[PDB]
């Protein structure tokens, strides 16, 4: 009768799905509540500079 | 400096007085009822009175 592609016949699937996507990179930046030169200055008085 | 003038053996008395101007930094802490200048000297009242 003739020739047919793979892709003439519908097909069905016989594999299960499993999809796995990776943890992506991540970045940490220098992150500080007060610095050392904000809680030096806190102080009201410096012995030094007066 | 004003110094008095030499007289021999004798307990000389001299007065001199120099009139300063200064720019200073003053800083205040809660409730800010004081504040302190550069100078280390208190002020006991509260910066914003009037």
Sequence with gaps: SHQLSRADITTVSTFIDLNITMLEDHEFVPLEVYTRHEIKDSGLLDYTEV | ?50
């Design chain 2, 1 to 50: 400096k004003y110094n008095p003038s030499r007289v021999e053996a004798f307990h000389r008395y001299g007065t001199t007085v120099n009139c300063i101007v200064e720019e200073v930094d003053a800083r205040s802490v809660y409730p800010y009822d004081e504040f302190v200048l550069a100078t280390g000297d208190f002020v006991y009242m509260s910066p914003f009175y009037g």
